[PDB]
């Protein structure tokens, strides 16, 4: 929350602990701290990206055995780390609410819950499509980095989708 | 370890010789003797929520820790080598154990809690209020080692439970309970009552029923 | 934060879910993706000049129509379909209307002082990553929001396409507005009465219409409270799923109950 | 309807591999400069470090040599607090970069850290006086640290980028260079001249540290 | 009406003085500081320069050494393209910082640039082995340039600010330090040990360069 | 006129030559180049200051003898350099139209 | 150009009037060498833009 | 540039000129000194809604 300077800081898996949720953003080395004028525009773009914010969830190791995985998203999780888009699959509000020991990602706009244990499929509310899962891993030095891109469009659905 | 005692003395000499003078000997009316308190008691303050407050007070805030995890270990080994007492539960690697301190029983992990300790806290694990300016803190922040160290090294006005009083096993079970356990709307209604009833009653006053 | 979240939900999602032209309407309105740099200037134009201008023109038409199509009146002693019993404009009606205007603006000023409305300072600046739990629109759009919440996540996927749940609520709003606009013609087609009516009829004297209006008001209240189910669940201790499903079941049960009760009450 | 693609219970998956980000192509071709230097050779740049280790495999010193604006702006820091004893370790530049525990390029005794192919690694065209191969005494006191520099630029980055990697070797002697002149002092044989072995490079006892300057 | 204040025929004026701005009291709460270092003395900081001149006032070289993280990083740039001949030079730290053309602290011949109050400017508590009083050597090729570093940290920024300003004095010898061991070589009088004057500091002919390290 | 970075750079008397005018601004060492975000707001303020811009004019040495100075402004000029506000004294438009060989600062407004 | 030239010429290089009988000619006819030399030398009532003031 | 210098001349200068209330009128209209950051929004409102109405 630092006002303006170094708003986005690299992250490591150890930072989260079991039953922890952290909102992360797609930061590039080129998108350095906000000190420069060239930066603080790339960083503002990152912050204002509608489809940018993601929620990184540390699934409790005890409950790791209840996890079901989607087609083509089986290796997306890094150990017990699951990165799901915050944007709700129905009308695109962030699904920022997270319930641990229930593993339910709740959206405040229209009360839709997604089962984080399984692929983040909606188990209540208006949402009908699962939240897109970001592939994640650790680069050299252990910092968390996306292992690719979402295998599906991430925002709310529209006519030209599912193909 | 030779380095752990050495680092401990340097960090001790720069924080608590003001209240525990020299080799863990308490300053009268400022702080207690630290001989016999041991690593886990040191774990229960700087490592745990209740780091000691420089202003004298009935209770302290679990203020943000002033020492890092390697430092908390160095400070602790200094007081366990100087004093001799309880040691913080540690895993096979040598880190302070947290998951291992998660007890298998939560049912009995709970029953233990209610007879022993539930009362000063809350059945939920929410705080309780206690003696003179003393409160029992919410145990939501506490990691499992923190939980085992409040019980083994009784902090302040918190009954001390020895490994004999509550076995090492039950303390884990106790951790399992006290961790497993852990505009438009008002504005529109205010319109429809205050403003709209005012307007409608005013109209009924001005107008005529017929 | 609050109002931008509301915009992101309604204006963006609903618009972009519409099947044939949804994304096109979204991009035309926002000049691009959702956070397009012209949304608020466009809404400012629409809200200070365009829509208020149309509202002023339609209010002028409304008042002129009421003025020259003399105001209808309830049946009474000397009141017939070919006369207006009341008070003349100059001495009494004008003074009481001006006094009522004074009292209404006094109520509004008193509420503006004593009651806090929309504390935007509390509601931080809009950021797509941030959100609250309330996330409601004003009470007049609360029924649309409640429709969004209650409708049961029915999505259709034609050949290589998606039909999100937003279209359901969009069509629901379209139907609501069409029925509201076309009711007098619907009522005249149904009943058969095209007679020039100048004498009102007491709601009790028309059981079917008062029953239908009570049913519609019940549905509107159900939707409005469904939009508030979050705070209702929070304060009045009722599970959020329970409130959602209470709304879902009621929006077909409560209208019927209220219709029957209102019909019998009128009779 | 329900989304066409869901619910793949099978194929449990695998742990993602460690990400190895590719360098930014011509698109984001911008990258940080690795150091500007004359680079009169295949290219070394303005960045070059090295670790002078001991016979036990432990690092003793850490040297750094690199051209900045046509002259090597170097710096050396002791990697341990007790590497050098309370005295002056005599630094020198050996042509052979192999910082082995003990080696002998010629046919003779293999002194500890004596992998140098001679004395001081002078320039290609210079083999007389103590050219850039030679170095003076750097002192480590009871604290046991080394950090101090001089101006020895008989060579440059081009000369350092020679056929064989060079090294910095610290023996246990000072820098005198026949301080006893022939006027008064005399040698073993009675000649007032100095010793060729002592004049070519700093000769001392067993080498204390040695580190290859080939970006070690 | 005309404005009240206009026109001045007399008092031709004066040329404005050279502006001498004052440090900001308002914008800066205190005084802005440059180099950061422990500086266990009255205060020297992480910035210390020096200019080693010649007997005729010519700039022989320009050295600069400063503490960064407990280890002093140093570097010297040649002041002239031909300050040093095609050979070697020995640099030593002299306790006396006076970089005079010729001076003699003791009662005896005054050697050129011999203002040092003894040999190597060792530490206060160290007077035996060649402590930090000895600096790295300066090897000059046909190019005639100086740039190279060693690890000499027997003294630090705290010890640099001693009772008297120190200096770096470069004579024109190599770095040997009695490289002829007593086993083979012998002294003038037949003893196999080395010379005390040679062991104390790098002894050579007339000093070539001398520069005070008191932020010269 | 560099677009954004180092918009204001220190100035020297030699840069101007007799019969030359240059628009200068009040730059401070603290108001460094526009690379940072703290800077490029100070610099924008400097650029957008209504009363900030000044014209530095070099009076020819031959014509230096025709100069008549104001009270309290006799020593303001640095040799043959005169700095006058660009803002016109009447309604505040810049008076940028400097005519040499007549030494007349004309305002276009 | 706007900071220095438009002052008297125009926004887009057209001419402008000056104190008394003078004027700034329209630049449309000037070729690049003539424009550069017009900056380099101050012909009459145009400030002389030295290379130090406006580097090449 | 043209419209801004025209505004600076007419509005700002002639408003500040007015003897007893000129500077006060200038500050009320521009919300501060001439380049006040509310001038163009205020003119936009006046021009699209208020004066056209
Ligand atoms: C909220 C609660 C606030 C506390 C007040 C609680 C007292 C409520 C008393 C009303 C109960 C009696 C009733 O049901 O009938 C009253 C009245 C007439 O009943 P009726 O017998 O069938 O009609 C024949 C009368 O002769 C009709 O003849 P009339 O029209 O000539 O009678 C008017 C006289 C008698 O009629 C009345 O209007 C009585 C109302 C007086 C109470 C209002 C003043 C006190 C509260 C002010 C807020 C502070 O009017 C007055 O003297 C001036 C009253 C102006 C109306 C202001 C009402 C809106 C303000 C309250 C809402 C704001 C809440 C903020 C907190 O009907 C109403 O409901 C009045 C409005 C109700 C106001 C309370 C809103 C709840
Ligand atoms: C939720 C909370 C509130 C939600 C809705 C509340 C509705 C209350 C409206 C009360 C109005 C009333 O009684 O006025 C007469 C009453 C006496 O005046 P009046 O001079 O005798 O009236 C002229 C005639 O008598 C002509 O008037 P009337 O007395 O012959 O008409 C009586 C009544 C006859 O109609 C009925 O019998 C309708 C009964 C509906 C019952 C539904 C509830 C079932 C709940 C079960 C399900 C739960 C699960 O008509 C209605 O009021 C229709 C209301 C239907 C809305 C139901 C919403 C659900 O008014 C007052 O003194 C105060 C009324 C203040 C209300 C202002 C808003 C009026 C706007 C619409 C009213 C209809 C036009 C009449 C003029
Ligand atoms: C904007 C929103 C704010 C509210 C404004 C709406 C107010 C509407 C109320 C209407 C009242 C009205 O017009 O009364 C005027 C009324 C005109 O009607 P009338 O006199 O009864 O003429 C015979 C009937 O009109 C003959 O009509 P009829 O009874 O046979 O029925 C035919 C009727 C058929 O019924 C309709 O269809 C009427 C509805 C019209 C549809 C939409 C037109 C209005 C659109 C307004 C848009 C505004 C934006 O057609 C009309 O009369 C249409 C007239 C349109 C005027 C609408 C005014 C608004 O009489 C006056 O003109 C009295 C005022 C005199 C003014 C002069 C005073 C002194 C002069 C001083 C000047 C400077 C002094 C310096 C020295
Ligand atoms: C979509 C939908 C309707 C879902 C169902 C959830 C729901 C609304 C359930 C009913 C809520 C209630 C009445 C809870 C109390 C427990 C309960 C159910 C008791 C039995 C109900 C029953 C049949 C009782 C018999 C007698 C009877 C009719 C009692 C009614 C009692 C009440 C609460 C009357 C008022 C109705 C009411 C205001 C309900 C809450 C609705 C809203 C939107 C309140 C808005 C509001 C809120 C939420 C504030 O926090 C607030 C804070 C500060 C100032 C103002 C306000 C404010 O106006
Ligand atoms: C910090 C700050 C800025 C604070 C201020 C807040 C702000 C920005 C704005 C609010 C400030 C103001 C100016 C508030 C007062 C608003 C105002 C004009 C109130 C007038 C009420 C008043 C003072 C009454 C005094 C009592 C008295 C003697 C009354 C009799 C004389 C009067 C005033 C008669 C007025 C008659 C009246 C309301 C005319 C309205 C004109 C219009 C638009 C339509 C006329 C009209 C009407 C009214 C119908 O009802 C109607 C019904 C059916 C068909 C046609 C018509 C029709 O044409
Ligand atoms: C919140 C609640 C939802 C919102 C509610 C508002 C919408 C309008 C409300 C109700 C509409 C349905 C009314 C009931 C319609 C009656 C049907 C019938 O059987 O026809 C008998 C009639 C009497 O004729 P009669 O000689 O008196 O003979 C006595 C015989 N027993 O015939 C006719 O003239 C008419 C025949 C055709 C009528 C067609 C009306 C609908 C037109 C389409 C608009 C959409 C409708 C949406 C419905 C929700
Ligand atoms: C009054 C201030 C003044 C400014 C400042 C000024 N000009 Fe001019 N310009 C003039 C005047 C007066 C002339 C007429 C010179 C002449 O006729 O000899 C002129 C002539 C010219 C001409 C000759 C055109 C032709 O066809 O003969 C060119 C080209 C020109 N200016 C370009 C420039 C450029 C480029 C700048 C860049 C800052 C500039 N001016 C700045 C006033 C100015
Ligand atoms: C006034 C400043 C103050 C500082 C700073 C302080 N303490 Fe204390 N300490 C106290 C007071 C008062 C108590 C009594 C409260 C209690 O018993 O928990 C206490 C309690 C303790 C206890 C529990 C004794 C027991 O058995 O009840 C231990 C262990 C301890 N301190 C160690 C430390 C260590 C280790 C540090 C710092 C590295 C430290 N303290 C810093 C004043 C201080
Ligand atoms: C009065 C009886 C009492 C009993 C019995 C008791 N406590 Fe406490 N506890 C306290 C009081 C008072 C404090 C405040 C002292 C302190 O925090 O230093 C406290 C401190 C703590 C803290 C401090 C760390 C934090 O969260 O801020 C934790 C955790 C805790 N107790 C949990 C337990 C658990 C778990 C047990 C038994 C399984 C237990 N307590 C037994 C009253 C009690
Ligand atoms: S916006 Fe997320 S459920 Fe509707
Ligand atoms: S604005 Fe009038 S003379 Fe400048």
**What single string gives the DSSP state of each residue in B40-54?**
HHHIIIIISS-PPPS
Chain C positions touching D5 (Cβ under 8 A) are none
- The Cα G30–Cα G46 span in angstroms is 15
Q: Which of F47, F52, F91 to mutate to test the interface with H (most CBs of H within 10 A)?
A: F91
What was the structure determination method?
Answer: cryo-EM
Give H11's DSSP letter: I
* H50: closest chain C residue by CA: C49
Number of domains in chain F: 1
Any idea where the domains of chain C sit in the sequence? 1-267
Q: What are phi and psi of E50, to 5 degrees?
A: -170, 150
F93, F109 Cβ separation under 8 angstroms: yes
Residue C23 · residue C33 · CB < 8 Å? no
The 3-state DSSP class for residue C3 equals helix
Straight-line distance from the first to the last Cα atom of chain D, in angstroms, rounded to the nearest whole number: 64
Return the closest-CA partner of residue C70 out of C175, C177, C192, C200: C200
Which residue in F has a C-alpha nearest to residue A34's C-alpha? F37
The residue among A29, A11, A30, A28 whose CA lies nearest residue A20 is A11
Contact C34, C8 (CB under 8 A): yes
Answer yes or no: are the C-beta atoms of A161 and D42 closer than 8 Å: no
End-to-end CA distance of chain F: 23
Distance of CA G14 to the CA centre of its chain: 10
Residues in binding site of C for heme b:
47, 62, 71-72, 118
CB-CB contact of C169 with C145 (8 Å)? no
- C-alpha–C-alpha distance, residues A35 and A33, integer Å: 6
Report chain B's C-alpha Rg in angstroms.
Answer: 25
Nearest CB neighbour to E151, from listed D68, D120, D148 = D148
Cβ neighbours, 10 Å, residue B129: 9
Task: List residues forming the annotated binding site of A for [2Fe-2S] cluster.
Answer: 88, 90-91, 93, 107, 110, 112
- What angle do helix axes B69-82 and B2-12 make, rounded to 10 degrees? 100
Q: What is the three-class DSSP state of D210?
A: strand
C43 neighbourhood in chain H, CB within 8 Å: none
Host domain of residue A100: 1-146
In a domain, A22, yes or no: yes
Please report which ligand is nearest the Cα atom of C205: 2
Extract the tokens encoding A153: 């469009």
Nearest 5 degrees, angle CA C212-CA C216-CA C221? 145
Q: CB–CB of E30/F94 below 8 Å?
A: no
Distance CA B125, CA B132 (A): 21
Report the alpha-carbon distance of residue B68 to residue B54 in Å, rounded: 19
Nearest to G47 among F12, F15, F20 (CB): F20
- Selection from A116, A121, A28 nearest residue A77 by Cα: A116
The residue with tokens 């209102």 is C262
Contact list, H35 vs chain F (CB under 8 Å) = 48, 50
Residue A136 sits at φ, ψ, to 5 deg, of -135, 160
Q: Find residue B128's DSSP bridge partners.
A: B136
Integer angstrom CA distances of residue E202 from D206, E93, E94, E169, E186: 21, 10, 11, 10, 19
Tell me which residue has tokens 């999602």. C13
C-alpha span between B107 and B104 (Å, rounded): 9
Strands A20-24 and A54-58, how do they pair? antiparallel
CA proximity to A107, closest of A80, A132, A126, A79: A126
Neighbours of chain G (3+ CB pairs under 8 A): F, H
DSSP string, B55-112: S--SS---PPPSS-HHHHHHHHHHHHHHT------B-SSSSBPSSTTS-S-SHHHHHH
- Are residues E117 and E164 in contact, defined by beta-carbon separation less than 8 angstroms? yes
- Residue C85 CA to residue E3 CA, distance in Å, equals 76
Instruction: Provide the token pair at D111.
Output: 């002194």
Q: At what angle do helices C207-227 and C142-150 cross, to 10 degrees?
A: 80
Placement of tokens 């309970």 in the chain: B177
Atom number, ligand 7, closest to the C-alpha of residue G29: 26
Q: Is A157 within the bounds of a domain?
A: no
H-only helix segments in chain D = 157-160, 196-200
Report the candidate in E127, E151, E39 with the shortest Cα–Cα distance to residue D81: E151
* Token output for B147: 């939980």
Q: CA F35 to CA F37: how far, in whole Å? A: 7
Q: Do chains F and E touch (3 or more CB pairs under 8 A)?
A: yes
Contact residues for B113 (Cβ-Cβ < 8 A; gap 6+):
B123, B174, B177, B178
Helix (H) or strand (E) holding G28: none
CB B44 within 8 A of CB B149: yes
- Asked if residue B62 belongs to a known ligand binding site, the reply is yes
Mutate-to-test residue for ligand 11 from F105, F107, F108, highest number of ligand atoms within 8 A of CB: F107
Q: Could you give the CA distance from residue E177 to residue G34 in angstroms, rounded to a whole number?
A: 73
A53: nearest Cα among A160, A159, A150: A150
Give the separation between CA B173 and CA B40, rounded to whole angstroms: 18
CATH number of the domain that residue F30 is part of? 2.102.10.10
What is the C-alpha separation between B79 and B8, in angstroms, rounded? 8
Is F41 annotated among the ligand-binding residues? Answer: no
Give the three-state DSSP class for B20: strand
Separation CA F56–CA G53 (nearest Å): 11
**Neighbouring residues of C258: CB distance < 8 A, sequence distance ≥ 6:** C214, C215, C217, C218
Task: Tell me, yes or no, whether A156 lies in a domain.
Answer: no
Write out chain D residues lying below 8 Å of E60, CB-based.
none
The CA distance from G9 to C120, in Å, is: 50
Q: Could you tell me whether strands D148-150 and B128-129 are parallel, antiparallel, or unpaired per DSSP bridges?
A: unpaired
Nearest-angstrom CA–CA distance, C242 and E37:
66
Give E189's Cβ-side CA count (13 Å radius): 4
Provide the token pair at G21: 């009988």
- Do A80 and A58 meet the contact criterion of CB atoms below 8 Å apart? yes
Report in angstroms the alpha-carbon separations of A58 from A147, E5, H17: 17, 77, 68
| Cα dihedral across residues F107, F108, F109, G1: positive or negative | negative
Measuring from atom 46 of ligand 5, which residue has the nearest CA? C63
CA angle A148, A154, A155 (to 5 degrees): 150
In this structure, the number of other CB atoms found within 10 A of the CB of residue C241 comes to: 14
Give the angle B96-B102-B104 at the CA atoms, nearest 5°.
145
Tell me how many degrees the CA angle D16-D19-D25 measures, rounded to the nearest 5. 140
Query: With left for phi above 0 and alpha for psi between -120 and 50, is residue B117 left, alpha or beta?
Result: left
Which subunits count as partners of chain B given 3+ CB pairs below 8 Å? C
Euclidean distance between CA atoms E63 and E213, whole angstroms: 8
Q: Are D67 and D46 in contact (CB under 8 A)?
A: yes
Task: For a ligand 10 pocket test, name from A84, A112, A123, A131 the mutation site with the most ligand atoms within 8 angstroms of its C-beta.
Answer: A112
Distance in Å, CA G7 to ligand 7 centroid: 10
CA of C70 to the centre of ligand 3 (A): 13
The answer to whether E94 touches E115, Cβ cutoff 8 Å, is yes
Angle, helices C94-114/B196-206, rounded to nearest 10 degrees = 160
Residue A24 near residue A33, CB atoms below 8 Å: no
Paired residues of D72 in beta bridges: D67
Decide if F36 touches A, using CB distance below 8 A: yes
Distances (CA, A) of G37 to B210, E102, F75, G33, G49: 94, 60, 35, 6, 9
CB contact under 8 A, C131 and A128: no
Q: Which of E129, E147, E201 sits opposite D71 (nearest CB)?
A: E147
Enter the resolution in angstroms.
Answer: 3.5
Q: What is the DSSP string of F7-25?
A: -S----GGGS-SS-EEEE-
DSSP state of B191: I
Q: Is residue A163 part of a domain?
A: no
Contacts of E29 in chain F (CB under 8 A): none
A19 Ramachandran zone, left/alpha/beta (phi>0; psi -120 to 50): left
H3, H4, H5: best to mutate for the F interface, most F CBs within 10 A: H5
Cβ contact D126:E87 at 8 Å: no
Cβ contact D40:A155 at 8 Å: no
H2 to chain G: which residues are within 8 Å by CB?
11
Length of chain A in terms of residues written: 163
Closest to B8 in 3D by CA, of B103, B95, B74, B82 = B74
Helix (H) or strand (E) holding F105: strand F104-106
Task: State the Rg of chain D over Cα.
Answer: 24
Sign of the CA dihedral B22, B24, B25, B30?
positive
Task: Give dist(CA E199, CA F4) in Å, integer.
Answer: 62
Which secondary structure element, helix H or strand E, spans residue D87, and what is its range? strand D87-94
Q: Please check whether residue D89 is in contact with residue D204, taking contact to mean a CB–CB distance below 8 angstroms.
A: no
Please tell me the CATH code under which domain C1-267 is placed.
1.20.810.10
Kind and range of the H or E run holding B170: helix B168-180
Phi, psi of D159 (to 5 degrees): -65, -40
Q: Are B72 and B90 in contact (CB under 8 A)?
A: no
H/E segment holding residue D61: strand D59-64
Gap between the Cα atoms of C220 and B176, Å rounded: 48
Helix (H, G, I), strand (E, B) or coil at E94: strand
Distance CA C216, CA C218 (A): 5
Q: Do residues E130 and E119 make contact, with C-beta atoms less than 8 angstroms apart?
A: no
- G47 close to F (CB below 8 A): yes
| Residue with token string 């409040």 | B150
Residue G21 has a CB neighbour count (10 Å cut-off) of 6
A40 has a chain F CB within 8 A of its CB: yes
d(CA G7, CA C112) in angstroms, rounded, equals 52
> Strand order in E72-78's β-sheet?
E72-78, E59-67, E49-53, E209-212, E167-171, E87-94, E138-140
Give the residues across from A78 on adjacent strands.
A81
- Helical (H) or strand (E) element with A14: none
> C137 with C149: CB under 8 angstroms?
no
Among C76, C99, C107, pick the best mutation site for testing chain B contact (most B Cβ within 10 A). Answer: C107
In whole angstroms, give the CA distance from residue C99 to residue F34. Answer: 61
CB contact under 8 A, A140 and D20: yes
Nearest to E148 by CA among D36, D150, D215: D150
Asked if residue B202 lies in contact with residue C103, where contact means CB atoms within 8 angstroms, the answer is yes
Ligand 9 atom with the shortest distance to the CA of B131: 12
């Amino acid at each position: 929350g630092r006002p303006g300077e170094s708003p986005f800081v690299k992250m490591r898996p150890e930072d989260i602990d079991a039953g922890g949720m952290e909102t992360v953003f797609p930061w590039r080395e080129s998108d350095g701290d906000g000190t420069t004028v060239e930066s603080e525009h790339k960083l503002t773009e990152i912050a204002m990206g509608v489809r940018n914010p993601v929620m990184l969830i540390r699934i409790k190791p005890a409950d790791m055995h209840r996890v079901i995985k989607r087609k083509g998203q089986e290796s997306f999780n890094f150990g017990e780390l699951f990165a799901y888009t915050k944007v709700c699959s129905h009308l695109g509000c962030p699904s920022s609410l997270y319930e641990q020991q229930t593993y339910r990602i709740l959206c405040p706009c229209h009360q839709s819950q997604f089962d984080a244990l399984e692929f983040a499929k909606p188990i209540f509310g208006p949402a009908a499509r699962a939240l897109a899962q970001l592939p994640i891993t650790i680069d050299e030095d252990g910092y968390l980095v996306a292992n690719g891109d979402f295998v599906e469009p991430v925002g709310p659905a529209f006519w030209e989708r599912k193909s | 370890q030779s380095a752990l005692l050495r680092t401990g003395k340097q960090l001790f000499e720069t924080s608590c010789v003001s209240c525990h003078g020299a080799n863990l000997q308490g300053v009268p009316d400022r702080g207690p003797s630290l001989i016999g308190t041991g690593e886990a008691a040191v774990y229960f303050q700087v490592s745990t929520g209740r780091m000691p407050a420089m202003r004298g007070e009935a209770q302290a805030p679990s203020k943000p820790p002033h020492f890092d995890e390697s430092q908390i270990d160095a400070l602790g080994a200094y007081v366990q080598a100087n004093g001799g007492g309880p040691t913080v539960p540690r895993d096979d690697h040598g880190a302070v154990a947290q998951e291992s301190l998660i007890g298998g029983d939560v049912a009995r992990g709970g029953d233990l809690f209610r007879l022993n300790c539930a009362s000063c806290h809350n059945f939920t694990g929410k705080g309780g209020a206690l003696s003179s300016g003393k409160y029992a803190p919410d145990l939501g922040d506490a990691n499992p080692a923190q939980i085992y160290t409040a019980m083994l090294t009784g902090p302040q006005n918190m009954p001390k439970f020895s490994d004999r009083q509550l076995t090492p096993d039950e303390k884990r079970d106790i951790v399992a309970y006290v961790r497993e356990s852990a505009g438009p709307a008002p504005e529109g209604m205010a319109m429809w009552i205050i403003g709209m009833v005012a307007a409608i009653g005013v109209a009924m006053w001005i107008g005529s029923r017929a | 934060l609050l109002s931008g979240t509301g915009i992101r939900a309604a204006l963006s999602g609903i618009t972009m879910g519409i099947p044939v032209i949804g994304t096109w309407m979204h991009w035309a309105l926002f000049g691009g993706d959702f956070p397009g740099e012209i949304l608020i200037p466009r809404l400012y134009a629409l809200h200070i000049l365009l829509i208020p201008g149309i509202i002023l023109a339609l209010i002028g038409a409304h008042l002129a129509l009421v003025w020259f199509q003399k105001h209808t009146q309830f049946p009474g002693p000397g009141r017939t379909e070919t006369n207006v019993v009341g008070v003349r404009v100059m001495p009494v009606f004008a003074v009481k209307s001006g006094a009522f205007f004074a009292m209404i603006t006094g109520v509004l000023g008193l509420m503006g002082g004593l009651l806090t409305i929309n504390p935007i300072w509390n509601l931080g600046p809009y950021k797509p990553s941030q959100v609250s739990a309330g996330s409601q629109p004003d009470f007049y759009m609360m029924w649309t929001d409640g429709l969004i919440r209650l409708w049961p996540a029915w999505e259709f996927y034609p050949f290589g396409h998606t039909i999100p749940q937003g279209v359901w609520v969009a069509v629901g709003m379209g139907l609501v507005f069409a029925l509201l606009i076309a009711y007098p013609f619907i009522e005249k087609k149904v009943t058969g009465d095209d007679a020039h009516h100048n004498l009102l009829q007491r709601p009790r004297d028309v059981p079917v219409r008062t029953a239908i209006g009570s049913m519609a008001i019940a549905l509107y209240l159900l939707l409005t409270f469904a939009c508030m189910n979050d705070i209702i669940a929070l304060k009045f201790h009722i599970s959020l799923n329970a409130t959602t499903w209470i709304g879902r079941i009621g929006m077909v049960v409560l209208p019927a109950i209220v219709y029957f009760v209102a019909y019998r009450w009128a009779i | 309807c329900s989304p066409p693609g869901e619910t793949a219970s099978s194929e449990p998956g695998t742990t993602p591999a460690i990400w190895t980000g590719s360098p930014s192509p011509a698109a984001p071709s911008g990258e940080d400069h690795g150091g500007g230097h004359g680079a009169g050779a295949a290219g070394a740049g303005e960045t070059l470090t090295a670790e002078l280790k001991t016979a036990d495999g432990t690092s003793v010193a850490t040297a750094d040599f690199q051209f900045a604006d046509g002259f090597a702006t170097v710096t050396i820091e002791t990697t341990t607090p007790g590497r050098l004893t309370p005295g002056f370790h005599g630094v020198h530049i050996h042509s052979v970069g192999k910082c082995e525990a003990n080696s002998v390029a010629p046919t003779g005794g293999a002194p500890g850290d004596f992998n140098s192919a001679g004395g001081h690694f002078q320039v290609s065209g210079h083999s007389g006086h103590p050219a850039s191969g030679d170095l003076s005494s750097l002192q480590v006191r009871a604290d046991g640290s080394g950090k101090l520099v001089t101006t020895t630029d008989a060579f440059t980055a081009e000369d350092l980028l020679d056929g064989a990697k060079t090294a910095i070797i610290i023996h246990e002697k000072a820098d005198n260079f026949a301080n006893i002149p022939p006027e008064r002092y005399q040698q073993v044989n009675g000649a007032p001249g100095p010793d060729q072995t002592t004049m070519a490079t700093g000769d001392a006892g067993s080498r204390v540290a040695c580190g290859v300057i080939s970006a070690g």
